[PDB]
Curated annotation (Swiss-Prot), chain A:
<comment type="function">
    <text>Involved in cytoskeletal rearrangements required for phagocytosis of apoptotic cells and cell motility. Acts in association with DOCK1 and CRK. Was initially proposed to be required in complex with DOCK1 to activate Rac Rho small GTPases. May enhance the guanine nucleotide exchange factor (GEF) activity of DOCK1.</text>
</comment>
<feature type="modified residue" description="Phosphotyrosine; by HCK">
    <location>
        <position position="183"/>
    </location>
</feature>
<comment type="subunit">
    <text>Interacts with ADGRB1. Interacts directly with the SH3-domain of DOCK1 via its SH3-binding site. Part of a complex with DOCK1 and RAC1. Part of a complex with DOCK1 and CRK isoform CRK-II. Interacts with PLEKHG6. Interacts with HCK (via SH3 domain). Interacts with ADGRB3. Interacts with DOCK5.</text>
</comment>
<protein>
    <recommendedName>
        <fullName>Engulfment and cell motility protein 1</fullName>
    </recommendedName>
</protein>
<feature type="domain" description="PH">
    <location>
        <begin position="26"/>
        <end position="139"/>
    </location>
</feature>
<feature type="short sequence motif" description="SH3-binding">
    <location>
        <begin position="170"/>
        <end position="177"/>
    </location>
</feature>
Swiss-Prot record, chain B:
<protein>
    <recommendedName>
        <fullName>Dedicator of cytokinesis protein 2</fullName>
    </recommendedName>
</protein>
<comment type="similarity">
    <text>Belongs to the DOCK family.</text>
</comment>
<comment type="subunit">
    <text>Homodimer. Interacts with RAC1 and RAC2. Interacts with CRKL and VAV. Interacts with CD3Z.</text>
</comment>
<feature type="domain" description="SH3">
    <location>
        <begin position="9"/>
        <end position="70"/>
    </location>
</feature>
<comment type="function">
    <text>Involved in cytoskeletal rearrangements required for lymphocyte migration in response of chemokines. Activates RAC1 and RAC2, but not CDC42, by functioning as a guanine nucleotide exchange factor (GEF), which exchanges bound GDP for free GTP. May also participate in IL2 transcriptional activation via the activation of RAC2.</text>
</comment>
Length: 190, 157
């Protein structure tokens, strides 16, 4: 509604802030990816994680076994954020089924360097694309940001309207009367 | 003769039915749903403060306020749910940011349930027996929730 929309616009910014924080915290935790077309004794899985300070991305191969997934890095171990020039997805990806198009994204940096990923699922795809964009000072566009926004913002609104239960909300702004003719109040402040 | 400011008699508490953008003190801006304590009135204006921010005081139009009360047990129970929801809500956001997925979801469902039950409690549409069972489901969820979130343990009222 009119006033409710106004309230959403006022709160939306802080909610987007929480979401950015959540996405970055997730990058820091890191995720496990599965390389596309890995063969001849090459590890099929690898991982990437953002440094706790948010300046560099650490990555490397993994050992997917019934026990765990021990990560063993190679010479090429990092990709500093400050050197990131862009993030592309889908057909824009150099390494580009179709089910994979939707989960593909690449970090282009430095000269002609590129770190290509294939998200394990849609959820992780959104987490990483939103996270990288945040880092790059860009807006988070995934469907997960839209749903997280709707989830957290709707709750805040509902909490805000609790005492409006069974009470009519006018469609248009009630009339603002003329200011008082005096300010000689009966009681004190605070 | 000008409208003098006088004590507000029966108009003690109200809720804003629209966002009121004031032009600055002495006017107190209000966001829809804000609950206020009304102390005085003069003409078409009230003077009071936000219940959840008593330091924020000033005047606002009578027209932007719906006068309510703040006795049937379901009423004070409804009030406890409101207060409980705000405390959980704060923690819920921290659960979100830290990606404590299980707890986040668990708290999310408890909040929806309580909001829905509180609405049923305030509906005055439940027969006597059902209402009693509903009140119990409400107090049990409040208490359990407060327990797992490590909040103060309430004692029946």
């Amino acid at each position: 509604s009119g006033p409710i929309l106004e309230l959403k616009e006022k709160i939306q910014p802080e909610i987007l802030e929480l979401i950015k924080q959540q996405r970055l915290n997730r990058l820091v935790e890191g995720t496990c990816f599965r390389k596309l077309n890995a063969r001849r004794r090459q590890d099929k899985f690898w991982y990437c994680r953002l440094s706790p300070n948010h300046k560099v991305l650490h990555y490397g191969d993994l050992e997917e076994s019934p026990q765990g997934e021990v990560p063993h890095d190679s010479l090429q171990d990092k990709l500093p954020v400050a050197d990131i020039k862009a993030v592309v997805t889908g057909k824009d990806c150099p390494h580009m089924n179709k089910e994979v198009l939707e989960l593909a994204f690449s970090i282009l940096y430095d000269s002609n360097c590129q770190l290509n990923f294939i998200a394990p699922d849609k959820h992780e795809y959104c987490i990483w694309t939103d996270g990288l964009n945040a880092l790059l000072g860009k807006d988070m566009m995934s469907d997960l940001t839209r749903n997280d926004l709707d989830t957290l913002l709707s709750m805040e609104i509902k909490l805000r309207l609790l005492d409006l239960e069974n009470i009519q909300i006018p469609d248009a702004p009630p009339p603002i009367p003329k200011e008082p003719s005096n300010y000689d109040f009966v009681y004190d402040c605070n | 003769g000008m409208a003098p400011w006088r004590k507000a008699d029966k108009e003690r508490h109200g809720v804003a039915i629209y966002n009121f953008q004031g032009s600055g003190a002495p006017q107190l801006s209000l966001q829809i749903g804000d609950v206020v304590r009304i102390q005085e009135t003069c003409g078409d204006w009230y003077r009071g403060y936000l219940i959840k921010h008593k330091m924020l005081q000033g005047i606002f139009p009578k027209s932007f306020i719906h006068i309510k009360e703040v006795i049937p047990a379901e009423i004070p129970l409804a009030q406890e749910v409101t207060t409980t929801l705000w405390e959980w809500g704060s923690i819920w956001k921290q659960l979100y940011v830290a990606s404590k997925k299980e707890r986040f979801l668990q708290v999310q469902s408890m909040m929806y349930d309580l909001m829905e039950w509180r609405s049923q409690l305030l509906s005055g549409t439940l027969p006597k027996d059902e209402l009693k069972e509903l009140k119990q489901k409400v107090t049990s969820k409040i208490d359990y929730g407060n327990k797992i979130l490590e909040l103060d343990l309430i004692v029946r009222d």
